[PDB]
Amino acid sequence: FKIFGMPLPLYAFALITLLLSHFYNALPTDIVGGFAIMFIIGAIFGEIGKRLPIFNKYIGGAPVMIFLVAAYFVYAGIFTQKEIDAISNVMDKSNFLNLFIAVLITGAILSVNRRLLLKSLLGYIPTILMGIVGASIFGIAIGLVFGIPVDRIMMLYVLPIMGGGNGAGAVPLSEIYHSVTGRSREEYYSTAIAILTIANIFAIVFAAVLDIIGKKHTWLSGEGELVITHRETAVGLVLSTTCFLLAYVVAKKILPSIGGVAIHYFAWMVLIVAALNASGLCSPEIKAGAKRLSDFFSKQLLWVLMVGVGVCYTDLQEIINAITFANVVIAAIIVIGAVLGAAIGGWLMGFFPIESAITAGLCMANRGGSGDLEVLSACNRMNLISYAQISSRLGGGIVLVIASIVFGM
Amino acid sequence: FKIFGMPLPLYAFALITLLLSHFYNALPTDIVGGFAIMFIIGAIFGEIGKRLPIFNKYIGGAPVMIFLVAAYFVYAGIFTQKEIDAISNVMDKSNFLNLFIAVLITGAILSVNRRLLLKSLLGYIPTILMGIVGASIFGIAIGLVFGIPVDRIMMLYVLPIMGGGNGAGAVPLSEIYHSVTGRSREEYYSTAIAILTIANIFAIVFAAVLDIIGKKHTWLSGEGELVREKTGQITHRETAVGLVLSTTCFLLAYVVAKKILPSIGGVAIHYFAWMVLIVAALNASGLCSPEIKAGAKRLSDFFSKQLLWVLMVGVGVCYTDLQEIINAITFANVVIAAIIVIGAVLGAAIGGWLMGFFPIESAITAGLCMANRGGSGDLEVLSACNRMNLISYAQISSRLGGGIVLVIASIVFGMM
Ligand SMILES: OC[C@H]1O[C@@H](O)[C@H](O)[C@@H](O)[C@@H]1O
Ligand SMILES: OC[C@H]1O[C@@H](O)[C@H](O)[C@@H](O)[C@@H]1O
C-alpha cells in the first residue's frame, strides 16, 4: 500500500526526518521547513481520517482529521514553537492562505460560461439575507429558551457568527461596538472570536451531515452544483496573483466602499475575474490552465492547507473559555437556523437546497475564508469557493451595515 | 506575439495592474504580492532580453536581462520600498531561493541511474582544485602586474571570489580573518563582498561566452553533459510527491548539518552539500519508484522553465547590491577580478579535460560556479549557459568546494 501516493517505506523516511527535526529542535522557519512538516503530518492523518470507519464519512473525513488533529497538537503543545512558527510563516507572513483561495477563485470562475455568470449573483444575495433571517429567528428563539435578552443574542451571538470571520467581523464588529456603545473592544472581541469559532466547528460538521443527507436524498442535492503545456498552467498562476493584486489596489486606494458597505478585496477579485472571463481576454487554453492549477491546489495541497488552518485559525484555549453548555447549544442552533434559512430561500430562488445551505448558510456562519476551505472540504464541494467567498466577503459587508443599525438601536 | 504565453491584450491587463499597485502604493508584502510583480516584470524583460540580438544570444539572454534590469531598478530606486520588501519576503523570509534549488537538485539527481552516481564525484573534486590553482596562478600573475603583494591577492581577491558566496565565504572568511589577524570583520567583508559580486557578474558573462564557443566548437562542449525501468505515468500526486521529497530531503540535510554531523573533519559541510548525498543515497536506495522519480523531474522542469524568470527578478533585487559594487569598481578590481575568473575557467577546463569531462561544462561547473556568488550565483550562471540541469554539480562546488576554500584560507591566513 502507499501513503499520499507515497509507498510506506518511503513515507517512513520522511516521517523519520520529521521526528529528527522535531526532537533535535532543528527546523527552518520558512516555506521549505513548513511544507516539509505540513506535507508529512497532513499525509498520515489525512489517510487515517480517510479510512476511520465512523470518523471517515463520505469525502469530508480526510481534511477534518488533519484540521482538528493539528489544532489538538497546538493546544496540547505537541508542536514546538519553531514548528508553529514555520507553519505560521507559511500561512501568514508568506500568506499561502490567500494565494490558495486566489488560485481557486480564478480556476473556478474562468471554467464557466460567460452567459451563465450574471444569472446567479442576482438570486444569490437574497438567499444570503434569507439565511440571516433564519439565523436570527432561531437564535432569538433558543436565546429566550435560555432566558437571554434579545439584544445580546444579536450583538454577542448572531451578528458575530454570521460575520465575515476574524478580520471581517471580530476586527470590525468590535470597532462598531466601541463607536456606538463606547465599551472596550476586548470585551466584545474576546466573546465574539470565541463563540464564532464554536459555530465554525458546527458549520464544518453540518457540512458533512448535509453531504450525507444530500447523497441519501438526491432530490435535495445538486451533487456539486448550485443552479496543455505547463506555460498554460503557469499563466493561470500569473492570473491568480495579478487578479488579486488588482482587487487589492481597488479595495485599498480606488473603490474601498461602494456605499454604506465596505467591499473586501476578495469580493472585488470575484468581479474582476468574472469580468476577465466575459472579456474573453484569456484563451480557452489559458482558461484551462487556471482550472488545472486550481485542481493541483484543491487535490494535492488541500491536505497541507488543513495542517496550517488547524494551527493558526483555531485557538482551542479561547474556545474552552466559552464552552459552557449554553454557548455550545445556542451557537449550534443559530447555525441550523442559517442552514434552514438559506435552504428555504435558495429553493424559492431556484438553487438546490443542500448547496444553498452550504454556500449561503454555513459559509456565512463559518470563520470566513479559512472557514470556507474548512467547510467546503468537508462536503467535497470545493468548486463552490467562489460562492462561499461572496458570502464571507460581500455577505460579511452586509452584516456590518445590519450591525451598526442593531448596535445603534 | 505573446508575453510569457500571454497574449498582448491580456498582458496589458496585468502590466496595467502592476502600475496601479505601483503608483497607488498598494501591495501586500507577501507571496501573492511578490509573484504578481515578479511574474509581470520578469515576463516583459524576459521577452525583451531575448528579442534584442545584441541583448540576447541563443536562450542565454532572457534571464540575464531580468537579472541585471531588476538590480538597476533597485539601485535607481525604481522599485518602491514595499515592492522590494514583497520580493525580499519571497526570497528570504519565505525562502523561495532554497526551495527552488532544493527542487532542482532532487529532480536532477533522481533522474539519473544509480550506477552512474559514484563515477563522477571522484573525478570532480580534483577538477575543482585544478580550478582554484588556475584561479590563484592567474590572480597572482595579474596582481604583480598591478604591483599588489601576493598575500592580498589571495586574502582580498582570490579566496573570497572562489569562496562559497555571501553566507559561505564573506560571513565565514571574515570570521577566519578576525581569528588569525584580529582586524575588524567589516574591513574584510566590505572589500570581499564587493569584489566577489564583481567577479559574479563576470562569471555570468563568460558562462554565455563559453556557450557561444561551445556551440561554435562542438568538440569542446558536451551540449549540457559533463561526462563523456520505464515511467508508466505522471500524476500531480507523482509531481506532488516530488515536492514532498524536495522539502523532506532538505529538512534532513538541515538537521544533519546543524545538530548531527555539522563538520566531517576540518571542513564544515553546508546543509545543501549533505542534501546532495542524501538525495543521491535515496536514488541508490530506490525507495522512490520510477513514477515518483519522474514526478521530481517534472516538478524540476516547472521551476526551471516557468518560474526561472520569476526567480531572476528576486535574484536581481536581493543578491546584487549595485552601490557596493560601484564603491569598488576601480579599473584595477574590475580587471584583476575578471582575470581570476578566467584563471578559474582555464583551470577547471584543463583539469576536467584530463579527468574525462567536457572542457566547457567543466569550466562552468568546477570553474565559474566556484567564482560566483554561491547558490544565488549558480542559478544566475547556469541560466546564462542554459545548462540548468547541472545545478547539482554547481552546488557541490559552491558548498563542498566552498568548505575547501575555508581550510585553504585558515592555512593562507595563518601563514600571512
Ligand atoms: O454554479 C455554476 C458554477 O459556478 C462556479 O463558480 C463553480 O466553480 C462551478 O462549480 C459551478 O458549476
Ligand atoms: O552528468 C550526469 C548527470 O548529472 C545530473 O546531476 C544532471 O542532472 C544530468 O543532466 C546529467 O546527465
Side-chain angles (χ1 to χ4, degrees), chain B residues 4-336:
Chain B
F4 188 63
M6 283 191 293
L8 294 145
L10 179 67
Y11 178 69
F13 168 71
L15 179 50
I16 284 161
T17 308
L18 171 62
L19 303 172
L20 287 173
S21 164
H22 181 66
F23 286 132
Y24 276 114
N25 192 66
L27 173 65
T29 58
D30 69 53
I31 281 180
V32 185
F35 283 131
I37 299 155
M38 298 165 96
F39 267 122
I40 297 164
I41 294 183
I44 185 71
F45 289 120
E47 295 290 357
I48 297 170
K50 180 172 169 179
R51 296 181 179 180
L52 298 176
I54 294 181
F55 291 59
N56 183 6
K57 303 179 200 177
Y58 300 89
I59 308 300
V64 172
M65 198 60 186
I66 296 165
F67 169 72
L68 296 174
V69 165
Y72 179 65
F73 276 52
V74 185
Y75 181 61
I78 303 175
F79 288 126
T80 58
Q81 188 54 41
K82 295 176 69 179
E83 272 161 51
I84 298 171
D85 288 22
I87 292 177
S88 175
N89 182 75
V90 175
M91 296 303 282
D92 293 321
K93 287 158 193 166
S94 305
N95 203 336
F96 183 69
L97 177 65
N98 285 3
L99 177 74
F100 194 101
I101 302 166
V103 170
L104 261 53
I105 291 169
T106 309
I109 292 175
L110 293 184
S111 287
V112 305
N113 311 311
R114 55 171 160 286
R115 276 227 179 182
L116 283 63
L117 297 174
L118 184 57
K119 294 185 171 153
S120 52
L121 183 64
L122 303 179
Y124 191 62
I125 292 162
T127 315
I128 299 172
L129 297 156
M130 208 83 82
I132 295 165
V133 172
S136 299
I137 296 306
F138 272 66
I140 301 160
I142 186 170
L144 296 169
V145 176
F146 267 83
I148 307 172
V150 175
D151 53 55
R152 292 198 164 287
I153 298 303
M154 299 297 284
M155 295 170 66
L156 295 186
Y157 294 67
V158 169
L159 283 171
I161 290 166
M162 303 303 281
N166 202 317
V171 174
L173 284 184
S174 76
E175 220 64 38
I176 297 164
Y177 184 73
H178 187 67
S179 294
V180 183
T181 309
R183 273 192 152 289
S184 59
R185 304 182 200 74
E186 288 50 51
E187 175 187 46
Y188 187 72
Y189 186 73
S190 63
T191 307
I193 190 60
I195 186 172
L196 68 83
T197 306
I198 296 167
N200 183 65
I201 304 306
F202 275 114
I204 298 163
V205 170
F206 306 137
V209 177
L210 289 168
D211 189 59
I212 295 167
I213 294 159
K215 300 177 185 183
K216 178 172 57 170
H217 302 306
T218 180
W219 82 77
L220 292 168
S221 174
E223 312 310 317
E225 290 289 8
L226 190 62
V227 180
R228 301 169 174 182
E229 294 177 350
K230 298 184 191 179
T231 58
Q233 297 143 16
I234 305 170
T235 72
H236 315 89
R237 184 50 44 77
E238 288 148 10
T239 65
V241 173
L243 184 60
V244 176
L245 294 185
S246 284
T247 60
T248 62
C249 276
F250 181 91
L251 180 54
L252 187 66
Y254 181 79
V255 173
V256 176
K258 230 77 173 183
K259 309 273 175 173
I260 299 183
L261 208 170
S263 83
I264 58 172
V267 188
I269 304 193
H270 186 266
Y271 56 72
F272 265 130
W274 277 112
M275 189 178 184
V276 183
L277 303 178
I278 294 174
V279 180
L282 193 69
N283 187 324
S285 75
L287 269 165
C288 316
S289 56
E291 283 81 348
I292 295 171
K293 296 167 82 179
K297 171 61 176 182
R298 286 289 287 262
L299 181 76
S300 196
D301 300 304
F302 185 49
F303 278 60
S304 56
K305 295 173 179 192
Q306 314 314 303
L307 312 183
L308 175 52
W309 286 17
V310 165
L311 179 75
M312 285 308 101
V313 178
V315 171
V317 167
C318 308
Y319 317 122
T320 40
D321 177 44
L322 296 177
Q323 93 210 325
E324 270 167 48
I325 303 173
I326 305 300
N327 291 305
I329 306 179
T330 56
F331 174 72
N333 308 334
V334 180
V335 180
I336 298 163

Side-chain angles (χ1 to χ4, degrees), chain A residues 108 112 224-226 383 386-387:
Chain A
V112 304
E225 291 289 8
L226 190 62
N383 65 306
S386 42
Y387 283 115

